[PDB]
Amino acid sequence: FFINILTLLVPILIAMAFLTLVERKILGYMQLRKGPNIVGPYGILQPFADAMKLFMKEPMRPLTTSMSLFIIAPTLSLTLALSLWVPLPMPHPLINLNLGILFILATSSLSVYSILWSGWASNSKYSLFGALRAVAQTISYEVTMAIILLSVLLMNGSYSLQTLITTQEHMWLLLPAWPMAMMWFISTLAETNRAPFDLTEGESELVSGFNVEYAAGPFALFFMAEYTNIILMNALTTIIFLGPLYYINLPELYSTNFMMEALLLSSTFLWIRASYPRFRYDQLMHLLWKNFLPLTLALCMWHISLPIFTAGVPPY
């Protein structure tokens, strides 16, 4: 078990730093630059040097802060994002939780709490604006997050995340739910806090939002939890709305199908990050609550309608 949690947790941190590496490289390729290829063999050494350098960067204990809550926020954010990864289905999950997608939804609702704890306990007006817009991003994302995670999972009929693997062996899940996939994508941009719907760590809005007072290793923990949440909910959109091929004798073909589909989905996540202009929280609350909340409730109505329209109800 300990060898399994080492080979799950240490390669996901190395792959998260290498995701930051290929994020900056494909982001700079979008912005017509070659990217950080000098310091590594084709640049395979730069966010490892960032995670090294932010250790002996000086941390900050300000006058105005409360230091216990100020230091208990990023350690809970790292524990949060690295223990959100364990009810992921994969071929076979490490935690075979019976209703684990509600734990995913609950700890992603916990993911928009450590940012508010940080933005209060930093004791800056800038961090307080970032904390209030993190509350506004909760107000935006959370009910449409739960309704998209409810209504298309009513077609699977169970909150066990293992039962979605057997559902979509021959066909994908974006073919029965194409508006639900793109509305899940634009709500998971709000939970992930990436540059379409990033409104609480922005250099043009505030001075980087909620990371005003956070230097060094705690800022490395917040960046760690940030990019762990990026690859995490890329894997969530991968594991719900697209269906890879399952052979029960060969899970490795399923894992490399997961690899190519998750690499194109993380490529379109950082492509949709680096393309668009960045929102304002008035029209974020306006387009979600006025436009995309009754569309989620109406496709939720149509997902009430479908198992009595045909075929019976799904299995337990």
């Binding site: 436009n291 009754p294 309608s305 009595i308 329209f309 019976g312 109800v313």
Partner: protein
């Protein structure tokens, strides 16, 4: 009819989101009156054995229920497995 048709035509041009939510909500309204499969899910959920159906005491009144499981006379599911 033309005034309300120009109202719903211009709403689907300008802001079609609420009116397509209302359209598929009315489609979910008009679903189960003309749905032919709407009386099958309740008897499928009746036919699944979540509990143990308690075997009855044999008293020899009539063979309304079978005295043997695997012979197909009795309440079967052969029109449900062919669905």
């Amino acid at each position: 009819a033309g005034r309300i048709s120009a109202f719903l035509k211009n709403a689907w041009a300008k802001e079609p989101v609420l009116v397509v939510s209302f359209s598929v909500w009315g489609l979910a309204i008009i679903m189960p009156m003309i749905s032919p499969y709407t009386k099958y899910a309740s008897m499928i959920n009746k036919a699944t054995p979540y509990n143990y159906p308690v075997p009855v005491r044999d008293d020899g009144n009539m063979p309304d229920v079978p005295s043997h499981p695997q012979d197909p006379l009795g309440p079967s599911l052969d029109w449900l497995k062919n669905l």
